[PDB]
Amino acid sequence: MIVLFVDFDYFYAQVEEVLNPSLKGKPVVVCVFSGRFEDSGAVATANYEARKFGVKAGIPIVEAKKILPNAVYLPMRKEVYQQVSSRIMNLLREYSEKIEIASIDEAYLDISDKVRDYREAYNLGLEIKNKILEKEKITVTVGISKNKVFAKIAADMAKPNGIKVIDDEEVKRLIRELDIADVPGIGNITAEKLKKLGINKLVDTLSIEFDKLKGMIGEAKAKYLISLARDEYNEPIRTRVRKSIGRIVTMKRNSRNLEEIKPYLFRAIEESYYKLDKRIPKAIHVVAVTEDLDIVSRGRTFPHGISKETAYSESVKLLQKILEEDERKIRRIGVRFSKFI
DNA sequence: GGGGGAAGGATTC
DNA sequence: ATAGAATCCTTCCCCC
Ligand SMILES: Cc1cn([C@H]2C[C@H](O)[C@@H](COP(=O)(O)NP(=O)(O)OP(=O)(O)O)O2)c(=O)[nH]c1=O
Ligand SMILES: [Mg+2]
Ligand SMILES: [Mg+2]
C-alpha cells in the first residue's frame, strides 16, 4: 500500500500572498484577534521568513509583535482560505477516488491502484505539485510511504516546497532513528512520559514490558506505538465525516454573571446553526474556557433532533450547570453540536 | 465484562 | 491572563 500525503506550506499566509502578491518576501503573520484588548489573540500561521525568527502557530500576537514589529500582521479570513482550500481538493479528487481530507490544508491519497512502485508515485507527486501551482498558484509538500503515519512524517521533513518518498528500508531506518516526539499524535505531555521511561525512538517500544507502557499512556496509544514499531500499522484512507460543529467566542471581560454571558452564548448558537447546513443534531455541548484556561463542558443528548429554539433553551441550563458545579470565571463561551441524523 | 452517556484529557491543525 | 476548531481516548457511571 502506497499513501500519498499532501499538506500546504504556511497555508493561511500563502493565500494572503497569491491574493496580494506584494506581501512576498516580507515576514507575514496571520492572526486571530479575540478583541479583549487590541492585539490579544494567537498566531494562526506565519510564513517561513517570519517562522525563521520564531513566529509559530499558537504564540500570542503580543509575543509575536515584540519579535517583528514591522512584519505584516493580517487578520484571518478563514472564509477565503476555505474556498481556496475546497478548490484545491477538487483537484486532488481527480488523482484518486479514495481520499481522506484530514484538515483545511491536508489530504491523504490511496494510490495503490494507480501506481505500482515509488518511482511513479514520486512522479505523480510532481504531477500534483505542478497542477496546484498552475491552477491556483500554491506550493505544497508531498509525503510518500506505506501508511498514513509515515507519509505524514515524510512530508514534515520535506517542508517547504518539497517532495519526499519513504521507502521500506528507510522506514526501518526511521523506526530506529526517529525521535519519538516527532511521531504524529504524541505531544509534550505524552512525549516525555516516554522519555521518563527512556523511550526516545519507536524501537524501544518493543523492548519495554507492555503492561507498564499501557498503564501510563493508555491502551490505544500503546498499540499505536507498538504496531508502528513492528511495521504493522494499517488504518485505511476513509472519507471523513464531520462529527462536530461549533463556535466559541472570547468575551470582553471575564464573568460569572449568567446574563452578561448570555448574548455571547446566544451569538454562538446562531452561528453554529448556520454552519450546521441541513444536518440536524441530537447532542449539544456548552463549553467554556476558564480564566486559568481549563476547559469545562456539560452536554445533553435527545431521542430527536434539536431545534434552534430548543438549543437556546437547554444551552442556558447547561451553562447554568457549569457555574453551579465550578466557580472560576469564564473567558470564552461556546457550543458544540454532535450526533447528527 | 462491556456497551453507552457524560466529563475530562490530550492532540491536531 | 493567548484564537478557534475538530477528533479520539480515558475514566467513572448506569445498566443489561
Ligand atoms: C497549527 C495550527 C494551524 N492553524 C491553521 C493555519 C495553518 O496555516 C493551517 C495549518 O496547516 P499546518 O500544516 O499545521 N501549518 P502551515 O500549513 O501554516 O505551515 P506548514 O504546513 O508547517 O508549512 O491551519 C491554526 O489556525 N492554528 C494552529 O495551531
Ligand atoms: Mg501546512
Ligand atoms: Mg497541516
CSV table of C-alpha atoms (C1' of nucleotides) and ligand atoms in Angstrom, one decimal:
chain,number,residue,atom,x,y,z
A,1,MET,CA,0.0,0.0,0.0
A,2,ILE,CA,1.3,3.4,-1.0
A,3,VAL,CA,-0.1,6.6,0.7
A,4,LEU,CA,0.5,10.0,-0.9
A,5,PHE,CA,0.2,12.7,1.7
A,6,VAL,CA,-0.1,16.4,0.8
A,7,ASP,CA,0.0,19.4,3.2
A,8,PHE,CA,0.1,23.0,2.0
A,9,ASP,CA,3.0,25.2,3.1
A,10,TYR,CA,2.2,28.0,5.6
A,11,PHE,CA,-1.3,27.8,4.1
A,12,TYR,CA,-3.1,30.8,5.5
A,13,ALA,CA,-0.2,33.2,4.8
A,14,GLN,CA,0.5,31.9,1.3
A,15,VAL,CA,-3.1,32.6,0.3
A,16,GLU,CA,-2.7,36.1,1.5
A,17,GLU,CA,0.3,36.3,-0.8
A,18,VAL,CA,-1.3,34.9,-4.0
A,19,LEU,CA,-4.2,37.3,-3.3
A,20,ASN,CA,-1.9,40.3,-2.7
A,21,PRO,CA,1.5,39.3,-4.4
A,22,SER,CA,3.4,42.2,-2.8
A,23,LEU,CA,3.4,40.5,0.6
A,24,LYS,CA,6.0,38.3,-1.0
A,25,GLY,CA,9.5,38.3,0.5
A,26,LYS,CA,8.4,40.0,3.7
A,27,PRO,CA,7.7,38.1,7.0
A,28,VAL,CA,4.0,37.6,7.1
A,29,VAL,CA,1.8,36.6,10.1
A,30,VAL,CA,-1.9,35.6,10.1
A,31,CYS,CA,-3.6,36.5,13.4
A,32,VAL,CA,-6.8,35.6,15.3
A,33,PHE,CA,-7.8,38.8,17.2
A,34,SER,CA,-10.1,38.0,20.1
A,35,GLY,CA,-11.0,41.6,20.9
A,36,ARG,CA,-10.4,41.6,24.6
A,37,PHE,CA,-7.5,44.1,24.3
A,38,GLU,CA,-6.4,45.1,20.9
A,39,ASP,CA,-3.6,42.6,20.0
A,40,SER,CA,-5.0,40.0,22.2
A,41,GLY,CA,-5.1,36.8,20.2
A,42,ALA,CA,-3.0,34.0,18.8
A,43,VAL,CA,-0.9,33.4,15.7
A,44,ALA,CA,-2.6,31.1,13.3
A,45,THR,CA,0.4,30.7,11.0
A,46,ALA,CA,3.4,32.7,9.8
A,47,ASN,CA,5.4,32.3,6.6
A,48,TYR,CA,8.9,30.8,6.7
A,49,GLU,CA,10.7,34.2,6.7
A,50,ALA,CA,8.8,35.1,9.9
A,51,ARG,CA,8.9,31.5,11.1
A,52,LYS,CA,12.7,31.6,10.9
A,53,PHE,CA,12.8,34.2,13.7
A,54,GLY,CA,10.5,32.2,16.0
A,55,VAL,CA,7.0,33.2,14.8
A,56,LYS,CA,5.0,30.0,15.1
A,57,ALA,CA,1.4,28.8,15.4
A,58,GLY,CA,-0.1,29.1,18.9
A,59,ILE,CA,2.1,32.0,20.1
A,60,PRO,CA,0.3,35.2,21.5
A,61,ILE,CA,0.3,38.0,19.0
A,62,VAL,CA,1.7,40.2,21.7
A,63,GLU,CA,4.8,38.0,21.8
A,64,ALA,CA,4.9,37.9,18.0
A,65,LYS,CA,4.9,41.7,17.6
A,66,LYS,CA,7.9,42.2,20.0
A,67,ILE,CA,10.0,40.0,17.7
A,68,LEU,CA,8.9,41.5,14.4
A,69,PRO,CA,7.1,44.9,14.7
A,70,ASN,CA,7.5,45.8,11.0
A,71,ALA,CA,6.2,42.4,9.9
A,72,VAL,CA,2.8,42.4,8.3
A,73,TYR,CA,0.0,41.3,10.6
A,74,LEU,CA,-3.2,40.4,8.9
A,75,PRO,CA,-6.5,39.2,10.4
A,76,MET,CA,-7.6,35.8,9.4
A,77,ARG,CA,-10.1,35.4,6.5
A,78,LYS,CA,-10.8,31.7,7.0
A,79,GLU,CA,-13.8,32.3,4.8
A,80,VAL,CA,-11.4,32.9,2.0
A,81,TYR,CA,-8.8,30.1,2.6
A,82,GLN,CA,-11.7,27.6,3.0
A,83,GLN,CA,-12.9,28.4,-0.5
A,84,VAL,CA,-9.3,28.4,-1.7
A,85,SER,CA,-8.8,25.0,0.0
A,86,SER,CA,-12.0,23.5,-1.4
A,87,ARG,CA,-10.9,24.3,-4.9
A,88,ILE,CA,-7.5,22.6,-4.4
A,89,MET,CA,-9.2,19.4,-3.0
A,90,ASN,CA,-11.4,19.1,-6.1
A,91,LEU,CA,-8.1,19.0,-7.9
A,92,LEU,CA,-6.9,16.0,-5.9
A,93,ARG,CA,-10.2,14.1,-6.2
A,94,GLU,CA,-9.1,13.5,-9.9
A,95,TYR,CA,-5.9,11.7,-8.9
A,96,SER,CA,-7.7,9.0,-6.7
A,97,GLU,CA,-11.2,8.1,-5.7
A,98,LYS,CA,-10.1,7.1,-2.2
A,99,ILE,CA,-9.0,10.4,-0.5
A,100,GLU,CA,-9.1,11.5,3.2
A,101,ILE,CA,-9.2,15.2,3.6
A,102,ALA,CA,-7.5,15.5,7.0
A,103,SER,CA,-8.0,19.2,7.5
A,104,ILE,CA,-8.1,22.7,5.9
A,105,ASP,CA,-4.7,22.0,4.3
A,106,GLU,CA,-4.2,18.2,4.3
A,107,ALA,CA,-5.2,15.2,2.2
A,108,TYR,CA,-4.2,11.6,2.1
A,109,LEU,CA,-4.4,9.6,-1.2
A,110,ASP,CA,-4.6,5.8,-1.7
A,111,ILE,CA,-2.6,5.4,-4.9
A,112,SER,CA,-2.1,1.6,-4.6
A,113,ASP,CA,-4.5,1.1,-7.6
A,114,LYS,CA,-3.0,3.9,-9.8
A,115,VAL,CA,0.8,3.4,-9.5
A,116,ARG,CA,2.8,0.3,-8.6
A,117,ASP,CA,6.2,1.4,-7.3
A,118,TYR,CA,7.6,4.5,-5.7
A,119,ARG,CA,9.4,6.0,-8.8
A,120,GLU,CA,6.0,6.6,-10.4
A,121,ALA,CA,4.5,7.6,-7.1
A,122,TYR,CA,7.2,10.3,-6.8
A,123,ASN,CA,6.5,11.4,-10.3
A,124,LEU,CA,2.8,11.6,-9.5
A,125,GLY,CA,3.8,13.8,-6.6
A,126,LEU,CA,5.4,16.2,-9.1
A,127,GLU,CA,2.3,15.8,-11.2
A,128,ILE,CA,0.2,17.1,-8.3
A,129,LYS,CA,2.7,19.8,-7.1
A,130,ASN,CA,2.5,21.4,-10.6
A,131,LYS,CA,-1.2,21.3,-11.3
A,132,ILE,CA,-1.6,23.0,-8.0
A,133,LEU,CA,0.9,25.7,-8.9
A,134,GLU,CA,-0.8,26.4,-12.3
A,135,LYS,CA,-4.5,26.3,-11.4
A,136,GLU,CA,-4.3,28.1,-8.1
A,137,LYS,CA,-0.6,29.2,-7.7
A,138,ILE,CA,0.2,27.4,-4.4
A,139,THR,CA,3.2,25.4,-3.3
A,140,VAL,CA,2.6,22.3,-1.3
A,141,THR,CA,4.7,19.5,0.3
A,142,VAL,CA,4.3,15.8,-0.6
A,143,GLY,CA,5.0,12.8,1.7
A,144,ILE,CA,5.1,9.2,0.3
A,145,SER,CA,5.2,6.0,2.2
A,146,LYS,CA,3.3,2.7,3.1
A,147,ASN,CA,0.7,4.1,5.5
A,148,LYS,CA,-0.8,7.4,6.6
A,149,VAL,CA,1.5,7.9,9.5
A,150,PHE,CA,4.8,7.5,7.6
A,151,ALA,CA,3.6,9.6,4.7
A,152,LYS,CA,2.9,12.3,7.3
A,153,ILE,CA,6.4,12.2,8.7
A,154,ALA,CA,7.7,12.1,5.2
A,155,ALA,CA,6.1,15.5,4.5
A,156,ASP,CA,7.2,17.1,7.7
A,157,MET,CA,10.8,16.7,6.7
A,158,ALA,CA,10.2,17.9,3.2
A,159,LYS,CA,8.6,21.3,4.1
A,160,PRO,CA,8.7,23.6,2.3
A,161,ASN,CA,8.0,23.1,-1.4
A,162,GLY,CA,9.5,19.6,-1.1
A,163,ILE,CA,8.6,16.1,-2.1
A,164,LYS,CA,9.7,13.0,-0.1
A,165,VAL,CA,9.5,9.3,-0.6
A,166,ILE,CA,9.9,7.0,2.4
A,167,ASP,CA,10.9,3.6,1.2
A,168,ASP,CA,10.6,0.4,3.2
A,169,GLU,CA,14.3,0.3,4.3
A,170,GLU,CA,14.3,3.9,5.5
A,171,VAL,CA,11.0,3.1,7.1
A,172,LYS,CA,13.1,0.5,9.1
A,173,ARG,CA,15.7,3.2,9.4
A,174,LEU,CA,13.3,5.8,10.9
A,175,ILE,CA,11.7,3.4,13.4
A,176,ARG,CA,15.3,3.2,14.6
A,177,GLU,CA,16.4,6.8,14.4
A,178,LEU,CA,13.2,8.9,14.6
A,179,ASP,CA,12.9,10.8,17.9
A,180,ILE,CA,9.6,9.7,19.3
A,181,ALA,CA,8.0,13.1,20.0
A,182,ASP,CA,8.0,13.6,16.2
A,183,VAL,CA,5.6,10.7,15.7
A,184,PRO,CA,2.2,12.1,14.9
A,185,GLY,CA,-0.2,12.0,17.8
A,186,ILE,CA,2.2,12.4,20.8
A,187,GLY,CA,2.7,16.0,22.1
A,188,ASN,CA,4.7,17.2,25.0
A,189,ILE,CA,2.7,15.7,27.9
A,190,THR,CA,3.0,12.2,26.3
A,191,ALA,CA,6.4,13.0,24.8
A,192,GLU,CA,8.4,12.8,28.0
A,193,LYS,CA,6.1,10.4,29.7
A,194,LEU,CA,8.1,8.2,27.3
A,195,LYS,CA,11.4,9.9,27.9
A,196,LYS,CA,10.7,9.3,31.6
A,197,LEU,CA,10.9,5.6,30.7
A,198,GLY,CA,13.8,6.1,28.3
A,199,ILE,CA,11.8,5.8,25.1
A,200,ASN,CA,13.2,8.3,22.6
A,201,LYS,CA,12.6,6.4,19.3
A,202,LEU,CA,10.0,3.9,18.2
A,203,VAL,CA,12.2,0.8,18.5
A,204,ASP,CA,12.3,1.0,22.3
A,205,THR,CA,8.5,0.4,22.5
A,206,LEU,CA,9.1,-3.3,21.7
A,207,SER,CA,11.9,-3.5,24.4
A,208,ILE,CA,9.6,-2.4,27.3
A,209,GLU,CA,7.0,-4.6,29.0
A,210,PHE,CA,3.6,-3.9,27.6
A,211,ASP,CA,1.7,-3.5,30.9
A,212,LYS,CA,3.9,-0.8,32.2
A,213,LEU,CA,3.6,1.0,28.9
A,214,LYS,CA,-0.2,0.6,28.8
A,215,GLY,CA,-0.6,1.6,32.4
A,216,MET,CA,0.6,5.1,31.8
A,217,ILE,CA,-0.3,6.3,28.3
A,218,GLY,CA,-3.4,4.1,27.9
A,219,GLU,CA,-4.2,1.1,25.8
A,220,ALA,CA,-4.9,2.9,22.4
A,221,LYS,CA,-1.6,4.8,22.3
A,222,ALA,CA,0.3,1.7,23.3
A,223,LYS,CA,-1.0,-0.5,20.4
A,224,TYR,CA,-0.5,2.6,18.2
A,225,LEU,CA,3.2,2.9,19.1
A,226,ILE,CA,3.9,-0.8,19.1
A,227,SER,CA,2.2,-1.5,15.8
A,228,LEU,CA,4.1,1.4,14.3
A,229,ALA,CA,7.3,-0.2,15.7
A,230,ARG,CA,6.6,-3.6,14.2
A,231,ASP,CA,6.0,-2.2,10.7
A,232,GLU,CA,2.4,-3.4,11.1
A,233,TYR,CA,0.4,-0.1,11.2
A,234,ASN,CA,-2.6,-0.3,8.9
A,235,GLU,CA,-5.6,2.1,9.0
A,236,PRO,CA,-7.4,2.9,5.7
A,237,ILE,CA,-7.9,6.1,3.9
A,238,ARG,CA,-11.5,6.9,4.8
A,239,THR,CA,-13.8,9.7,3.6
A,240,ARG,CA,-14.1,11.9,6.6
A,241,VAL,CA,-17.5,12.8,8.0
A,242,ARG,CA,-17.9,15.9,10.2
A,243,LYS,CA,-19.0,14.7,13.6
A,244,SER,CA,-18.9,18.0,15.4
A,245,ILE,CA,-20.0,21.6,14.6
A,246,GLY,CA,-19.4,24.5,17.0
A,247,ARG,CA,-18.4,28.1,17.6
A,248,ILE,CA,-16.8,29.7,20.7
A,249,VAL,CA,-16.1,33.4,21.3
A,250,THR,CA,-13.9,35.4,23.7
A,251,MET,CA,-15.8,37.8,25.9
A,252,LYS,CA,-14.5,41.3,26.6
A,253,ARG,CA,-14.3,40.6,30.3
A,254,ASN,CA,-14.3,37.5,32.4
A,255,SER,CA,-17.7,37.0,34.1
A,256,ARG,CA,-19.6,34.6,36.3
A,257,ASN,CA,-22.9,36.5,35.7
A,258,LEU,CA,-25.4,34.4,33.7
A,259,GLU,CA,-27.0,37.4,31.8
A,260,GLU,CA,-23.8,39.2,30.6
A,261,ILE,CA,-22.6,35.8,29.2
A,262,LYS,CA,-26.0,35.1,27.6
A,263,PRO,CA,-25.6,37.2,24.5
A,264,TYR,CA,-22.3,35.6,23.5
A,265,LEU,CA,-23.7,32.1,24.1
A,266,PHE,CA,-26.7,33.1,22.1
A,267,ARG,CA,-24.5,34.5,19.3
A,268,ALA,CA,-22.5,31.3,19.4
A,269,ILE,CA,-25.7,29.2,18.9
A,270,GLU,CA,-26.9,31.3,15.9
A,271,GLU,CA,-23.6,30.9,14.1
A,272,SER,CA,-23.3,27.2,14.9
A,273,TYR,CA,-26.8,26.6,13.4
A,274,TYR,CA,-25.7,28.3,10.1
A,275,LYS,CA,-22.7,26.0,9.9
A,276,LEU,CA,-25.0,23.0,10.6
A,277,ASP,CA,-26.3,23.2,7.0
A,278,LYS,CA,-29.4,21.0,7.0
A,279,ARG,CA,-27.7,18.4,9.3
A,280,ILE,CA,-29.9,18.0,12.4
A,281,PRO,CA,-28.1,17.3,15.6
A,282,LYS,CA,-29.0,15.2,18.7
A,283,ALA,CA,-26.3,16.3,21.2
A,284,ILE,CA,-25.4,19.8,22.4
A,285,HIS,CA,-22.3,20.7,24.5
A,286,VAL,CA,-22.0,24.1,26.2
A,287,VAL,CA,-18.2,24.5,26.5
A,288,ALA,CA,-16.4,27.3,28.4
A,289,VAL,CA,-12.8,28.3,28.7
A,290,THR,CA,-11.9,29.4,32.2
A,291,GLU,CA,-9.7,32.3,33.5
A,292,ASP,CA,-6.8,29.8,34.1
A,293,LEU,CA,-7.7,28.3,30.6
A,294,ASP,CA,-9.1,25.0,31.7
A,295,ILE,CA,-11.9,23.6,29.5
A,296,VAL,CA,-15.3,22.8,31.2
A,297,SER,CA,-18.2,21.2,29.4
A,298,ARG,CA,-21.7,20.0,30.0
A,299,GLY,CA,-23.7,18.0,27.5
A,300,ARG,CA,-27.1,16.5,26.8
A,301,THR,CA,-28.5,14.1,24.2
A,302,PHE,CA,-32.0,13.7,22.8
A,303,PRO,CA,-34.0,11.0,21.2
A,304,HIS,CA,-34.8,13.6,18.5
A,305,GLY,CA,-33.1,16.4,16.7
A,306,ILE,CA,-32.6,19.8,18.4
A,307,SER,CA,-34.2,22.9,17.0
A,308,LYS,CA,-32.7,26.4,17.3
A,309,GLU,CA,-35.2,27.4,19.9
A,310,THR,CA,-34.7,24.2,21.9
A,311,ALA,CA,-31.0,24.7,21.6
A,312,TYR,CA,-31.3,28.2,23.1
A,313,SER,CA,-33.3,26.8,26.0
A,314,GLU,CA,-31.2,23.9,27.1
A,315,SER,CA,-27.9,25.7,26.5
A,316,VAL,CA,-28.7,28.1,29.3
A,317,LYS,CA,-29.4,25.1,31.6
A,318,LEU,CA,-26.1,23.5,30.7
A,319,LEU,CA,-24.3,26.9,31.1
A,320,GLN,CA,-26.1,27.2,34.4
A,321,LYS,CA,-24.9,23.7,35.4
A,322,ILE,CA,-21.3,24.8,34.6
A,323,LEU,CA,-21.1,27.6,37.2
A,324,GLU,CA,-23.2,25.7,39.7
A,325,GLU,CA,-20.5,22.9,39.7
A,326,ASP,CA,-17.5,25.1,39.0
A,327,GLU,CA,-16.8,28.6,40.4
A,328,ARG,CA,-13.9,30.0,38.4
A,329,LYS,CA,-14.6,32.9,36.0
A,330,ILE,CA,-15.4,32.2,32.3
A,331,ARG,CA,-13.4,33.8,29.4
A,332,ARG,CA,-14.6,32.2,26.2
A,333,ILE,CA,-18.1,30.7,25.9
A,334,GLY,CA,-19.4,28.5,23.1
A,335,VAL,CA,-21.4,25.5,21.9
A,336,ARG,CA,-20.7,22.2,20.1
A,337,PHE,CA,-23.3,20.1,18.3
A,338,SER,CA,-22.8,16.3,17.9
A,339,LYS,CA,-24.8,13.2,16.9
A,340,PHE,CA,-26.3,14.1,13.6
A,341,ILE,CA,-29.1,12.3,11.8
B,1,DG,C1',-17.2,-7.7,31.2
B,2,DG,C1',-18.9,-4.2,28.1
B,3,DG,C1',-21.9,-1.2,25.6
B,4,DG,C1',-23.4,3.7,26.0
B,5,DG,C1',-23.7,8.6,28.0
B,6,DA,C1',-21.0,12.2,30.4
B,7,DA,C1',-16.9,14.6,31.7
B,8,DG,C1',-12.1,15.4,31.4
B,9,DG,C1',-7.6,14.8,28.6
B,10,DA,C1',-4.5,15.1,25.1
B,11,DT,C1',-3.6,16.2,20.2
B,12,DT,C1',-4.3,18.1,16.0
B,13,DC,C1',-4.4,22.0,12.6
C,1,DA,C1',-4.4,36.0,31.7
C,2,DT,C1',-3.2,33.9,24.1
C,3,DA,C1',-7.7,32.0,18.9
C,4,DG,C1',-10.6,29.0,17.0
C,5,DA,C1',-12.0,24.4,15.6
C,6,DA,C1',-12.3,19.4,15.4
C,7,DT,C1',-11.2,14.4,16.9
C,8,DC,C1',-10.1,10.4,19.5
C,9,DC,C1',-9.4,8.1,24.1
C,10,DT,C1',-9.9,7.5,29.0
C,11,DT,C1',-12.4,7.0,33.3
C,12,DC,C1',-16.5,6.8,36.1
C,13,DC,C1',-21.1,5.6,35.9
C,14,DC,C1',-25.8,3.4,34.6
C,15,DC,C1',-27.5,-0.8,33.0
C,16,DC,C1',-28.1,-5.4,31.0
D,1,LIG,C1,-1.0,24.5,13.8
D,1,LIG,C2,-2.0,25.4,13.5
D,1,LIG,C3,-2.5,25.7,12.3
D,1,LIG,N1,-3.6,26.6,12.0
D,1,LIG,C4,-4.1,26.9,10.6
D,1,LIG,C5,-3.3,27.9,9.8
D,1,LIG,C6,-2.3,27.0,9.2
D,1,LIG,O1,-1.7,27.6,8.0
D,1,LIG,C7,-3.1,25.8,8.8
D,1,LIG,C8,-2.5,24.5,9.3
D,1,LIG,O2,-1.5,24.0,8.4
D,1,LIG,P1,-0.2,23.4,9.0
D,1,LIG,O3,0.3,22.2,8.3
D,1,LIG,O4,-0.5,23.0,10.5
D,1,LIG,N2,0.9,24.6,9.2
D,1,LIG,P2,1.0,25.5,7.8
D,1,LIG,O5,0.4,25.0,6.5
D,1,LIG,O6,0.6,27.0,8.1
D,1,LIG,O7,2.6,25.6,7.7
D,1,LIG,P3,3.5,24.3,7.3
D,1,LIG,O8,2.5,23.1,6.9
D,1,LIG,O9,4.2,23.8,8.7
D,1,LIG,O10,4.4,24.6,6.2
D,1,LIG,O11,-4.3,25.9,9.7
D,1,LIG,C9,-4.1,27.3,13.1
D,1,LIG,O12,-5.0,28.1,12.9
D,1,LIG,N3,-3.6,27.0,14.4
D,1,LIG,C10,-2.6,26.1,14.6
D,1,LIG,O13,-2.2,25.9,15.8
D,2,MG,MG,0.5,23.1,6.1
D,3,MG,MG,-1.1,20.6,8.5
